[PDB]
Each structure stands twice: as C-alpha cells, then as structure tokens.
Amino acid sequence: ANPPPPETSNPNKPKRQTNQLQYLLRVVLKTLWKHQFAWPFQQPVDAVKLNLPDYYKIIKTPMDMGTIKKRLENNYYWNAQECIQDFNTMFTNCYIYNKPGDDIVLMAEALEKLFLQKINELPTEETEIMIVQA
C-alpha cells in the first residue's frame, strides 16, 4: 500500500526564492527531465506496481523529481541546499533499496552524474529574489 505522496506545500513552513533555487527549476530540473533515464524518477515510486517488497520499510523518505518540481514551483524550499538534499535522497534511496550494478542503480548513477554537473553551474553566491508576477 503506497503512502500519500510527499507534501509539496506547507503554509507554516518558511518559504523563499533565491537565484540558485530559480536556476534549479528552470535550468537544472529542465535538463534532467529530458534525460534518457528521467522516466523512472519523474513520479513517486509505486511499490505495488513495481513489485518492490518492503520498499516503505526500507525507504523512510520516498522522493522523486515530480515532487521536487512541485516543491520548486510552490517555493517550498528555504534555499538551494534544501532542494539538493531532496535530489540526493532520491538517488540514495535507489542505492539503499537495490544492489550495486542493478540496472536501476546504473540509471540513477548516470542521472546523478548529470545532476552534479548541472549544479556545478549554480550562481556562486546565493541571493534572495522576488519575482512578483510569476
């Protein structure tokens, strides 16, 4: 039985926009979304359909790019590092649940490599922005 998907907004969680969060949404995630290995990670894991026994016992924090995209669009994060942590949770979940060299691990590893390449391009200093008419 799959849990509800992770929250993508929180009216009591402090929210903010920065140049780096902005770059994460409109450059990094856009580039990842079209990668040949994006498809397994564009929505939450459905452990029932995929036949992943004990997935939600082993994986305490399910995460996916569909959720990260909504979180970015809803200005859910305080800073870029918080968003980067969700990406890292997504990749490491895969490494935890599966075995090294498994096909899904290889795909996650390649996607992660591209992710790390793109976040190397982030603006050097993180500064707040406020795009009002967004």
21 binds ligand 82V (CB under 6 A): no
> Tell me, what DSSP letter sits at residue 17?
E
The stretch near ligand 82V (CB under 6 A) out of 9-17, 20-28, 35-43, 65-73 is 35-43
50 is an interface residue for ligand 82V by CB under 6 A? yes
Asked whether the beta carbons of 64 and 41 are under 8 A apart, the reply is yes
Stretch that binds ligand 82V, among 12-20, 23-31, 69-77, 90-98 (CB under 6 A): 90-98
Minimum CB separation of residue 117 from ligand 82V in Å reads: 21
Establish if 104 lies at the interface with ligand 82V (CB under 6 A).
Answer: yes
Residues whose CB is less than 8 angstroms from the CB of residue 78 and which lie 6 or more positions away in sequence, other chains included: 14, 15, 16
Q: Is 38 in the site for ligand 82V (CB under 6 A)?
A: no
Q: Judge whether 109 and 98 are in contact, CB under 8 Å.
A: no
Read off φ and ψ for residue 48, nearest 5 degrees.
Answer: -70, -55
User: Rounded to an integer, what distance in angstroms lies between the CA atom of residue 93 and that of residue 112?
Assistant: 12
Give least dist CB 127 to ligand 82V, A.
Answer: 34
**Chain residues that interact with ligand 82V, rule: CB under 6 A:** 39-41, 45, 50, 52, 94, 97-98, 104
